[PDB]
Amino acid sequence: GSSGSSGMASDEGKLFVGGLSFDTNEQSLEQVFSKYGQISEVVVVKDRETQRSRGFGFVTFENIDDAKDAMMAMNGKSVDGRQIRVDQAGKSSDNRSGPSSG
Numbered sequence: 001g002s003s004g005s006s007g008m009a010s011d012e013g014k015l016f017v018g019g020l021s022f023d024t025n026e027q028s029l030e031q032v033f034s035k036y037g038q039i040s041e042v043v044v045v046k047d048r049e050t051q052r053s054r055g056f057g058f059v060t061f062e063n064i065d066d067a068k069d070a071m072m073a074m075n076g077k078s079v080d081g082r083q084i085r086v087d088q089a090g091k092s093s094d095n096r097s098g099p100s101s102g
Contacts (some may be wrong), residue, residue, distance in 0.1 A: 016089035
């Protein structure tokens with residue numbers, strides 16, 4: 001097929017990584033994404049029964065450019081001899097509030 005406008009440019013900060021090796025943990029990822037740029041936090045989705053690892057995760061970056069900066073690097077990279085991919089994940093979070101005065 002042939003696409004016209006090749007460019008989303010709608011990064012929010014979170015990245016969508018898939019095909020992560022079981023070994024790949026919240027730390028490993030960071031250790032890598034850290035060499036590319038700054039990181040805010042990591043999130044490795046897991047099952048509810050075995051609670052091991054679904055097979056994908058997401059690393060939150062301070063700002064937008066911060067993430068996209070690393071995406072252009074990981075996007076189609078090999079972490080420890082793998083073939084995972086990286087691209088704009090999107091925006092997914094739940095509201096939350098906390099006390100101030102006590």
